Amino acid sequence: MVFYFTSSSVNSSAYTIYMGKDKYENEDLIKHGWPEDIWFHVDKLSSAHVYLRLHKGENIEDIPKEVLMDCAHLVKANSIQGCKMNNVNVVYTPWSNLKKTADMDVGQIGFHRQKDVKIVTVEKKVNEILNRLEKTKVERFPDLAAEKECRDREERNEKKAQIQEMKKREKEEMK
Amino acid sequence: MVFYFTSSSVNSSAYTIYMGKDKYENEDLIKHGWPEDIWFHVDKLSSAHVYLRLHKGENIEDIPKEVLMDCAHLVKANSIQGCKMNNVNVVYTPWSNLKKTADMDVGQIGFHRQKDVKIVTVEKKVNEILNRLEKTKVERFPDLAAEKECRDREERNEKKAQIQEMKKREKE
């Protein structure tokens, strides 16, 4: 079972956040995450792994601050010791930067490059973020392999689409 | 290519709306729609077919009014003659009520029951609804058979979850 929350930004676009129930659902959230996903975790402390899926064409450095603080506060509330602390740091990196090896545990994750691992300090505990975020809480039991290859199929259909309209243009250029 | 808009209501939950690019793409939106989908169309006039996908456990009669008017105004704006009119009627029915036969046209859809087809009249023309909806426009090229089979697989997995959770409930 995976939890899904909705983070609304300033430009009235809804961002999808998801969070596994325990370590084993998150093993498959690591295995089947999308390139549009941004992984959030409390730095230097035990916590859950929060994920934020961006829109097509969006980058990690272009995340609205409200959404970034929604993910940060959400991942801090679901930390055993981070939730009771006032000031915590949250590392977040693109899903494509996560590295999982055989020598690793369940829940333990590595990085391909610490250069694309970013930091943000959540300085306090605000309850409206978590209340608003849970009022949008939907619980699903998804088959993430199939969903991720629906994303891959969608991307392939867009690339073939652009290929077919660029052959349309290059052929109709000759009138 | 399919268009996808986001209608946020006062519950702070986002509702997904999607609309095909033409009639033939909407043939496949008809064939592969989800049971959570609510079909919107301008009554008695040609228009596009707008779809609103509900959340798990949501019914057609429980749609927030803001979302219902977002779908209605969106389907009237994408009507050749509905957009120029002040007062139009919009019929909307669950996707499971749509009926498509071989003798039917492309774009022409039927109903399994006219009782589960609801009506709502849009009395005005609002540009802020369409502007706000257009700011959120995402265009995708989805494989709707595979996505609907992810929905059916998801429901099957919830059924296994509750089945084995009462199986262990009896064992505790």
Curated annotation (Swiss-Prot), chain B:
Residues the record lists as N6-acetyllysine modifications: 23
Q: Which residues lie on this side of the membrane: Extracellular?
A: 1-66
Q: This protein's superkingdom?
A: Eukaryota
Q: Which gene encodes it?
A: CCDC25
Its record classes its membrane topology as:
Single-pass membrane protein
GO terms in the biological process aspect are:
positive regulation of cell motility
Where do the segments described as DNA-binding lie?
Answer: 21-25
Q: What does this protein do?
A: Transmembrane receptor that senses neutrophil extracellular traps (NETs) and triggers the ILK-PARVB pathway to enhance cell motility. NETs are mainly composed of DNA fibers and are released by neutrophils to bind pathogens during inflammation. Formation of NETs is also associated with cancer metastasis, NET-DNA acting as a chemotactic factor to attract cancer cells.
| Compositional bias segments (type: Basic and acidic residues) | 148-172
Q: Where would you find this protein in the cell? A: Cell membrane; Endomembrane system
Q: What is this protein called?
A: Coiled-coil domain-containing protein 25
List the coiled-coil residues: 117-172
Which keywords does the record carry?
A: Acetylation, Cell membrane, Coiled coil, DNA-binding, Membrane, Phosphoprotein, Transmembrane, Transmembrane helix
What does the annotation say about its assembly with partners?
Interacts (via cytoplasmic region) with ILK.
The membrane-spanning stretches of this chain are 67-83
Ranges per topology, Cytoplasmic: 84-172
Query: What family does the entry list?
Result: Belongs to the CCDC25 family.
One GO cellular component term:
endomembrane system
Q: Name one GO molecular function term.
A: DNA binding
